[PDB]
């Protein structure tokens, strides 16, 4: 298996989620 490529797409997932859910939480906080 491409363990290295998976590690990359994991970091990318976690980044996307932190950004997206972070801003979603700010959105509601300002609602």
């Amino acid at each position: 298996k491409p363990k290295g490529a998976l590690a990359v797409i994991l970091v990318l997932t976690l980044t996307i989620l932190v950004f997206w859910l972070g801003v979603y939480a700010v959105f509601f906080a300002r609602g």
């Binding site: 490529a5 590690a7 990318l12 996307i16 997206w20 959105f27 300002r30």
Partner: protein, 554 residues
């Protein structure tokens, strides 16, 4: 040189790259002053002693945006996405047309630069009416962009000539990339061409009293979204088809590389209302439909993420790397042509995460027109695209000029790309965080030093970045000039093949490849999608125009 007689396309490609890097240098001079400003430090007095024609922060910001994000990126895309397919096919581009495209760009640039430099078009790189710049800025710009229609013709011509000579062969990979890319660009470019011909030009000439600002922005963003994919895709063509060789491996999938580009062709253009989430007079259903389709335009980069990572990992393993991290350490980190796109891809992970945020309709109300936005786009264009082009100094330049890169120049290029990358990451932090604190973009906030007390912390990041990037820019100017004005010429370097990667061996999926080669068809699909996504709104707007008077507020 006997090399330019056999490959005259090398000289024209060099002229595009050089002029591109000169615009980047000029436009970038303003970037450190702007990072200091977003760090609440006012260095404009210094800048004005140095460059006495600069009348304001906002004239500096117009120059920075137009030179770096419009001019540099386009010239790079014209160099890469003509010369690479031409070398892959081993065929000469129509040289009359190649030079015509160059001179159109040069002349368009010179004519726009006049009013920009004279403080007659301080309207930024978006030039939103009713702010009213000098007609020459709109005319110079229109001619500059129209240069690219010539490039499109050049590549479609190459492709057709090749296909005539090779009936029933599938399009070679880099040429397939460039064909879908330039056809995507053609459909993308129509928004701005319409906006300029139908409104901005008659208006700045004095022919019509006003322009309707909503129609003007809508037609602007029809083009303003796909133009960023037009910046990005030349860096992607190198990242897929060149970087894996530089990394010491191979491209792990030709079909997955073609599929990403076909997804860009279909999805780059019908999504621009994601720049208009906060605009009146556009129906929220259609905002949602562009939001979904924008989330889909994300998928080709999500696919790129994996295909490219797996290609790098494969290279690292070929070079002996083992573990879960050994593959990374084994890669050629002494080679600036390898390092620069890799670092740019690392910063693209937060860059793309912020883009997916921005795309998410109601989430955009948190960040719109704040510093977050420049935080996102410095990661995408000012970091990945720019670093990839900088890394080309190190394989492409020698190939075009025969001029060797010395050991010392190599190490200097290493330091430049690292400082540039790290400076972009630090500023991304300061700008994303100031944006979440409601600091607006496009603002000389250093002139209102008590307006933003809550942003004190990320402001330190922007100062630091402004200094780190000043140093990276100075070293880059020094480096580029050392390599350009260099003594030695080794003609064999200009005759060496480009460093194009092989593709990993494995079936693969002919029929998918054959299906994606149905370019006429995929193009009509892309174009249908634009009528579907834009038509209904533009019918309504054009049937209810409300033009308004022009202003000069500088």
């Amino acid at each position: 040189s006997r090399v330019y007689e056999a490959y005259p396309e090398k000289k024209a490609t060099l002229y595009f790259l050089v002029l591109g890097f000169l615009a980047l240098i000029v436009g970038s001079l303003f970037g450190p002053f702007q990072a200091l400003n977003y760090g609440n430090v006012d260095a404009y007095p210094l800048l004005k002693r140095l460059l006495p024609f600069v009348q304001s922060y906002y004239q500096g910001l117009t120059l920075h945006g137009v030179l770096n994000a419009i001019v540099f990126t386009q010239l790079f895309a014209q160099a890469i996405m003509v010369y690479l397919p031409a070398r892959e096919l081993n065929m000469r581009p129509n040289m009359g047309l190649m030079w015509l495209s160059w001179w159109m760009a040069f002349i368009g640039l010179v004519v726009a630069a006049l009013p920009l430099l004279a403080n007659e078009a301080t309207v930024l790189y978006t030039f939103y009416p009713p702010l009213k710049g000098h007609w020459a800025f709109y005319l110079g710009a229109s001619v500059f962009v129209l240069s690219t229609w010539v490039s499109i013709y050049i590549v479609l011509d190459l492709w057709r000539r090749w296909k005539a000579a090779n009936p029933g062969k599938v399009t070679p990979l880099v040429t397939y990339m460039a064909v879908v890319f330039w056809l995507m660009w053609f459909l993308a470019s129509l928004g701005l061409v319409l906006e300029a011909v139908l409104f901005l030009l008659p208006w700045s000439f004095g022919l019509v009293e006003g322009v309707d600002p909503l129609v003007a922005r809508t037609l602007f963003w029809w083009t303003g979204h796909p133009i960023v994919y037009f910046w990005l895709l030349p860096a992607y063509a190198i990242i897929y088809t060149i970087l894996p060789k530089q990394a010491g491996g191979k491209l792990v999938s030709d079909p997955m590389a073609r599929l990403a580009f076909l997804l860009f062709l279909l999805l780059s253009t019908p999504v621009g209302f994601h720049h208009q989430f906060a605009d009146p007079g556009i129906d929220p259903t259609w905002k949602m439909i562009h939001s979904v389709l924008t989330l889909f335009v994300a998928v080709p980069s999500l696919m790129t993420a994996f295909t490219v990572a797996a290609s790098l990992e494969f290279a690292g393993r070929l070079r002996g790397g083992r573990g879960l991290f050994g593959w990374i350490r084994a890669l050629p980190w002494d080679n600036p042509a390898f390092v620069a796109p890799v670092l740019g891809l690392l910063g693209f992970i937060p860059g793309g995460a912020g883009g997916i945020v921005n795309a998410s309709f109601t989430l955009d109300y948190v960040v719109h027109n704040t510093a977050w936005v420049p935080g996102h786009f410095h990661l995408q264009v000012a970091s990945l695209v720019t670093l990839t082009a900088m890394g080309s100094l190190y394989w492409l330049l020698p190939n075009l000029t025969g001029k060797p890169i010395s050991d010392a120049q190599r190490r200097l290029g290493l330091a430049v790309v690292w400082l540039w990358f790290l400076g972009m990451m630090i500023m991304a932090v300061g700008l994303h965080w100031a944006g979440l604190l409601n600091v607006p973009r496009r603002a000389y906030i250093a002139q209102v030093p008590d307006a933003y007390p809550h942003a004190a912390v990320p402001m330190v990041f922007n100062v630091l970045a402004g200094i780190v990037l000043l140093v990276a820019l100075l070293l880059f100017i020094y480096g580029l000039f050392s390599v350009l004005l260099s003594r030695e010429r080794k003609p064999e370097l200009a005759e060496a093949p480009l460093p194009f990667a092989e593709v990993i061996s494995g079936p693969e999926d002919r029929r998918l490849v054959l299906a994606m080669d149905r370019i006429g068809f995929w193009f009509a699909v892309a174009a249908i999608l634009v009528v579907l996504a834009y038509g209904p709104t533009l019918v309504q707007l054009f049937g209810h125009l409300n033009p308004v008077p022009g202003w000069r507020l500088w």
